[PDB]
Design a protein around this motif. Structure first.
Motif, PDB file in Angstrom:
ATOM      1  N   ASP A 107       0.333  -0.980   0.150  1.00  0.00           N
ATOM      2  CA  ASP A 107      -0.006  -0.072   0.172  1.00  0.00           C
ATOM      3  C   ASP A 107       0.854   1.152   0.032  1.00  0.00           C
ATOM      4  OD1 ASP A 107      -2.450   1.282   0.344  1.00  0.00           O
ATOM      5  OD2 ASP A 107      -1.981   1.700   2.194  1.00  0.00           O
ATOM      6  N   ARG A 108       2.093   0.695  -0.037  1.00  0.00           N
ATOM      7  CA  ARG A 108       3.212   2.594  -0.341  1.00  0.00           C
ATOM      8  C   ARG A 108       2.518   3.459  -1.259  1.00  0.00           C
ATOM      9  NH1 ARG A 108       9.024   0.764   2.039  1.00  0.00           N
ATOM     10  NH2 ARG A 108       9.526   2.231   0.155  1.00  0.00           N
ATOM     11  N   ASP A 109       2.948   4.562  -1.356  1.00  0.00           N
ATOM     12  CA  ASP A 109       2.856   4.953  -2.535  1.00  0.00           C
ATOM     13  C   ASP A 109       3.532   4.865  -3.410  1.00  0.00           C
ATOM     14  OD1 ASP A 109       4.715   7.277  -0.471  1.00  0.00           O
ATOM     15  OD2 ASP A 109       4.615   7.352  -2.381  1.00  0.00           O
ATOM     16  N   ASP A 110       5.271   4.279  -3.242  1.00  0.00           N
ATOM     17  CA  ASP A 110       5.951   3.945  -3.908  1.00  0.00           C
ATOM     18  C   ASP A 110       6.463   2.574  -4.585  1.00  0.00           C
ATOM     19  OD1 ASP A 110       6.640   3.550  -1.401  1.00  0.00           O
ATOM     20  OD2 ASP A 110       8.783   4.125  -1.401  1.00  0.00           O
ATOM     21  N   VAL A 111       4.853   2.129  -3.636  1.00  0.00           N
ATOM     22  CA  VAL A 111       4.878   0.479  -4.355  1.00  0.00           C
ATOM     23  C   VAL A 111       4.015   0.559  -4.947  1.00  0.00           C
ATOM     24  CG1 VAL A 111       4.780  -2.093  -3.348  1.00  0.00           C
ATOM     25  CG2 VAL A 111       6.583  -0.547  -2.139  1.00  0.00           C
ATOM     26  N   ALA A 112       2.838   0.435  -3.990  1.00  0.00           N
ATOM     27  CA  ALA A 112       1.281   0.615  -4.916  1.00  0.00           C
ATOM     28  C   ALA A 112       0.522  -0.500  -5.602  1.00  0.00           C
ATOM     29  CB  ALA A 112       0.828   2.327  -5.590  1.00  0.00           C
ATOM     30  N   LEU A 113       0.740  -1.687  -4.841  1.00  0.00           N
ATOM     31  CA  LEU A 113       0.423  -2.873  -5.579  1.00  0.00           C
ATOM     32  C   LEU A 113      -1.170  -3.259  -5.201  1.00  0.00           C
ATOM     33  CD1 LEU A 113       3.686  -4.023  -6.707  1.00  0.00           C
ATOM     34  CD2 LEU A 113       1.812  -3.312  -8.372  1.00  0.00           C
ATOM     35  N   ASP A 129      11.089  -5.581   6.988  1.00  0.00           N
ATOM     36  CA  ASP A 129      10.415  -3.840   7.461  1.00  0.00           C
ATOM     37  C   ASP A 129      10.721  -3.806   5.781  1.00  0.00           C
ATOM     38  OD1 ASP A 129      11.428  -3.798   9.705  1.00  0.00           O
ATOM     39  OD2 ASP A 129      13.325  -2.409   9.341  1.00  0.00           O
ATOM     40  N   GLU A 130      10.680  -3.788   4.638  1.00  0.00           N
ATOM     41  CA  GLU A 130      10.239  -3.524   2.764  1.00  0.00           C
ATOM     42  C   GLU A 130      10.868  -5.489   2.238  1.00  0.00           C
ATOM     43  OE1 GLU A 130      14.110  -4.409   1.354  1.00  0.00           O
ATOM     44  OE2 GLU A 130      12.002  -3.967  -0.341  1.00  0.00           O
ATOM     45  N   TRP A 131       9.591  -5.395   1.638  1.00  0.00           N
ATOM     46  CA  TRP A 131       9.435  -7.128   1.367  1.00  0.00           C
ATOM     47  C   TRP A 131      10.417  -7.487   0.014  1.00  0.00           C
ATOM     48  CZ3 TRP A 131       9.326 -10.406   4.904  1.00  0.00           C
ATOM     49  CH2 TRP A 131       8.691  -9.449   6.312  1.00  0.00           C
ATOM     50  N   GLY A 132      10.290  -5.962  -0.841  1.00  0.00           N
ATOM     51  CA  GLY A 132      10.985  -6.098  -2.086  1.00  0.00           C
ATOM     52  C   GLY A 132      10.230  -6.245  -3.467  1.00  0.00           C
ATOM     53  N   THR A 133      10.405  -7.233  -4.068  1.00  0.00           N
ATOM     54  CA  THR A 133       9.211  -7.311  -5.802  1.00  0.00           C
ATOM     55  C   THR A 133       8.301  -8.117  -4.953  1.00  0.00           C
ATOM     56  OG1 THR A 133      10.364  -8.677  -6.617  1.00  0.00           O
ATOM     57  CG2 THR A 133      11.240  -6.749  -7.416  1.00  0.00           C
ATOM     58  N   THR A 134       7.054  -7.966  -5.711  1.00  0.00           N
ATOM     59  CA  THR A 134       6.083  -9.157  -5.518  1.00  0.00           C
ATOM     60  C   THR A 134       6.466 -10.494  -5.857  1.00  0.00           C
ATOM     61  OG1 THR A 134       4.039  -7.411  -7.202  1.00  0.00           O
ATOM     62  CG2 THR A 134       4.136  -9.935  -6.196  1.00  0.00           C
ATOM     63  N   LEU A 135       7.731 -10.716  -6.274  1.00  0.00           N
ATOM     64  CA  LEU A 135       7.941 -12.229  -6.215  1.00  0.00           C
ATOM     65  C   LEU A 135       8.589 -12.417  -5.094  1.00  0.00           C
ATOM     66  CD1 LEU A 135       8.939 -14.815  -7.884  1.00  0.00           C
ATOM     67  CD2 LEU A 135      10.519 -13.288  -9.124  1.00  0.00           C
ATOM     68  N   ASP A 136       9.761 -10.918  -4.569  1.00  0.00           N
ATOM     69  CA  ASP A 136      10.137 -11.695  -3.409  1.00  0.00           C
ATOM     70  C   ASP A 136       8.883 -11.670  -2.401  1.00  0.00           C
ATOM     71  OD1 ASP A 136      13.155 -10.722  -4.133  1.00  0.00           O
ATOM     72  OD2 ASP A 136      12.353  -8.791  -4.435  1.00  0.00           O
ATOM     73  N   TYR A 195       2.949  -4.958 -12.967  1.00  0.00           N
ATOM     74  CA  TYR A 195       1.492  -4.514 -12.879  1.00  0.00           C
ATOM     75  C   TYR A 195       0.588  -4.974 -13.225  1.00  0.00           C
ATOM     76  CZ  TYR A 195      -2.149  -0.534 -15.072  1.00  0.00           C
ATOM     77  OH  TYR A 195      -2.942  -0.337 -15.168  1.00  0.00           O
ATOM     78  N   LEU A 196       0.651  -5.696 -14.556  1.00  0.00           N
ATOM     79  CA  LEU A 196      -0.234  -6.743 -15.489  1.00  0.00           C
ATOM     80  C   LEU A 196      -0.344  -8.030 -14.646  1.00  0.00           C
ATOM     81  CD1 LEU A 196       1.243  -6.706 -19.169  1.00  0.00           C
ATOM     82  CD2 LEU A 196      -0.779  -6.206 -18.066  1.00  0.00           C
ATOM     83  N   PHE A 197       0.031  -8.361 -13.578  1.00  0.00           N
ATOM     84  CA  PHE A 197      -0.235  -9.604 -12.528  1.00  0.00           C
ATOM     85  C   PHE A 197      -1.204  -9.378 -11.484  1.00  0.00           C
ATOM     86  CE2 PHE A 197       0.692 -12.454  -8.893  1.00  0.00           C
ATOM     87  CZ  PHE A 197      -0.057 -13.339  -9.235  1.00  0.00           C
ATOM     88  N   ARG A 203      -3.037  -6.850 -11.672  1.00  0.00           N
ATOM     89  CA  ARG A 203      -3.756  -6.070 -12.332  1.00  0.00           C
ATOM     90  C   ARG A 203      -5.278  -7.396 -12.220  1.00  0.00           C
ATOM     91  NH1 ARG A 203      -6.448  -2.197 -11.462  1.00  0.00           N
ATOM     92  NH2 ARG A 203      -5.368  -1.757  -9.694  1.00  0.00           N
ATOM     93  N   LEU A 204      -4.073  -8.348 -13.570  1.00  0.00           N
ATOM     94  CA  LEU A 204      -5.529  -9.424 -13.719  1.00  0.00           C
ATOM     95  C   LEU A 204      -5.204 -10.590 -13.397  1.00  0.00           C
ATOM     96  CD1 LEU A 204      -4.384  -9.261 -17.962  1.00  0.00           C
ATOM     97  CD2 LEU A 204      -5.924  -8.029 -16.624  1.00  0.00           C
ATOM     98  N   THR A 205      -4.172 -11.164 -12.313  1.00  0.00           N
ATOM     99  CA  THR A 205      -4.636 -12.041 -11.322  1.00  0.00           C
ATOM    100  C   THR A 205      -5.185 -11.750 -10.029  1.00  0.00           C
ATOM    101  OG1 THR A 205      -3.177 -13.637 -12.392  1.00  0.00           O
ATOM    102  CG2 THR A 205      -3.750 -14.355 -10.335  1.00  0.00           C
ATOM    103  N   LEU A 206      -4.986 -10.797  -8.913  1.00  0.00           N
ATOM    104  CA  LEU A 206      -5.123 -10.297  -7.900  1.00  0.00           C
ATOM    105  C   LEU A 206      -6.580  -9.601  -8.224  1.00  0.00           C
ATOM    106  CD1 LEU A 206      -2.118 -10.027  -6.916  1.00  0.00           C
ATOM    107  CD2 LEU A 206      -2.985 -12.127  -6.660  1.00  0.00           C
ATOM    108  N   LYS A 207      -7.103  -9.533  -6.633  1.00  0.00           N
ATOM    109  CA  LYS A 207      -8.650  -9.000  -6.331  1.00  0.00           C
ATOM    110  C   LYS A 207      -8.257  -7.386  -6.429  1.00  0.00           C
ATOM    111  CE  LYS A 207     -12.229 -12.884  -5.711  1.00  0.00           C
ATOM    112  NZ  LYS A 207     -12.625 -13.368  -4.567  1.00  0.00           N
ATOM    113  N   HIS A 208      -9.212  -6.657  -6.777  1.00  0.00           N
ATOM    114  CA  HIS A 208      -7.976  -5.367  -6.694  1.00  0.00           C
ATOM    115  C   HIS A 208      -9.869  -4.364  -6.339  1.00  0.00           C
ATOM    116  CE1 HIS A 208      -7.853  -4.649 -10.924  1.00  0.00           C
ATOM    117  NE2 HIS A 208      -7.642  -5.448 -10.340  1.00  0.00           N
TER     118      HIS A 208
END
Ligand SMILES: [Ru+3]
Ligand SMILES: [Ru+3]
Ligand SMILES: [Ru+3]
Ligand SMILES: [Ru+3]
Ligand SMILES: [Ru+3]
Ligand SMILES: [Ru+3]
Ligand SMILES: [Ru+3]
Ligand SMILES: [Ru+3]
Lengths: 173, 173, 173, 173
Positions: free
Chosen positions: D38-44, D87-94, D164-166, D168-173
């Motif tokens: 939810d961070r402004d600089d992550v925003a997924l 404290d910070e979790w990297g990418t969606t993959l990480d 971004y595509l993952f 938007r197109l896989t996860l509920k939002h």
């Protein structure tokens, strides 16, 4: 005189008129079967219903053939309907055997007319039979065969009891 | 023994039993494709659904053939179902190519059986195929061809991204 | 390769693939039984329905096993499905005896797989069988046993009459 | 003091209290993951929702364990919840890799507690885990594995676009 007739041979026209007569004749046979089973000394209401419904189906078959004959620009010609082959139809078994014999003959007439139309390159005729008659007849024959097998299973030892049970538990009444 | 069989050659009866085996075999192939796409390391749910639905359609095809075989008085004879040709099906592209290969083979079997029935003057068989199988197969093949083209368009440069998008945006999930 | 697999032995994975084959094989057997009872010279529609429904249940059983195999990170491997043991299944009694023999064999396979999973300390496998298969099979076997007893009661003297009545009054049609 | 406790070892009681702590700790980890996304600089947002929902599921898991502990006459004992590992979790993959690592550890704890209860002849405990936890965890791990595969497919060349595509197109939002 027709202003529409196209690709509709005199041979097919005549064979359609004969098939009409065969269907009406089958309807008449089924009317006689139906009423036989309604006699007070026969009294098998499900058997009566089964044949009365077939009488109506065969009539409808004839009417569809006549409609098509006019749609193609052919001319309906009616002959005598010969009375049914028997005045009394014996047991349910005898009757269902007679029914299957009749239906096989109608089926062969359908097949013979389809072969004629294929030889004359009349695809509308072929399609008309395939779509309204050939499968309907196969399904009917299969149902009669199924019935005959169950009738036969039930004769064994106590034919009256078997005849009653078939009528009560298989046939609609 | 059948009391109904009429105009139903031994050649057609045997070819119907072989076509049943070909349809069941196709169903089995599609079950394997479907489950491959459900693997955790493949995970393309729309692809999984597409093949699982085909498995069911092919089974239904076989059951309709068997029903007809009995309706005609033929006798169903079952053989082994050979396991599918592959244990792992590669990419969506590989899989859809394999699917089209399979469907072309089934189509040719339909066409071969239709030619047999035409040569044997079996119009009920011909009609049964025309009405329940030939157009259904043409529509299916066209859909697979459409899919293959869109899959192929999407490989270009970034095959993983293309594979994901096809599954998400074309296939139901 | 799987990134999820955990506590899932190669022995269980292989036995799950064999159980899939046993369930599909049972489905195929039931398809053959069902269609036998739909023959024109057998014609026991309730018997046909009973076996056709079992074919579907066994297929569903296999699909649930395959789903679980993927959920655990195992890899589905398919073998040939051997054709059913008979081409013609005799009387309803013969058929229901054959069905109970088949089900006992499937049950023993379930029990053997449960024992394997207990020995391997695989409680998810054990639970999966207990919750979706073991009770379902016990209930099915009890129903087949009930049927067999009623079939047997009805042979006595007049086997055809007994066979008809069982199909009409016990089995859904 | 309890008047109800029966067949409930001190060893199981203590291991249930530790499993509660592991579930709460997992919930806390998932709260941190959720808020990171939810961070402004992550925003997924779909990633945020996925982890926030897991936080709630893990909490519910702990509450069910505590309810059971009281149902058996055991005494809940709480320890510190250790802060999450990052404290910070990297990418969606990480993040999804970290999630699967966490879930495998919870699964192993479930399995270890089930083995303990089997050794102590505590079938209620074994059943409680089988019915509410073991399959739920297998299904979750399979879903995370599926996600990880799709994430990985999408990195290839253009990791931002894939991420971004993952979402938007896989996860509920
Ligand atoms: Ru009447
Ligand atoms: Ru009547
Ligand atoms: Ru799926
Ligand atoms: Ru699927
Ligand atoms: Ru049936
Ligand atoms: Ru059936
Ligand atoms: Ru949010
Ligand atoms: Ru959130």
């Amino acid at each position: 005189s027709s202003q529409i007739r196209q690709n509709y041979s005199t041979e097919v026209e005549a064979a359609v008129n004969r098939l009409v007569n065969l269907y009406l004749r089958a309807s008449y046979t089924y009317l006689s079967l139906g009423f036989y089973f309604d006699r007070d000394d026969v009294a098998l209401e499900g058997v009566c219903h089964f044949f009365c419904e077939l009488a109506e189906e065969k009539r409808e078959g004839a009417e569809r053939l006549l409609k098509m004959q006019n749609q193609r620009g052919g001319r309906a010609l009616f002959q005598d309907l010969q009375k049914p082959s028997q005045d009394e139809w014996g047991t349910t078994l005898d009757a269902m055997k007679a029914a299957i014999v009749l239906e096989k003959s109608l089926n062969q007439a359908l097949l013979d007319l389809h072969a004629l139309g294929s030889a004359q390159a009349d695809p509308h005729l072929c399609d008309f039979l395939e779509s309204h008659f050939l499968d309907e007849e196969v399904k009917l024959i299969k149902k009669m065969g199924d019935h005959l097998t169950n009738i036969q299973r039930l004769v064994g030892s106590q034919a009256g009891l078997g005849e009653y049970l078939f009528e009560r538990l298989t046939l609609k009444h």
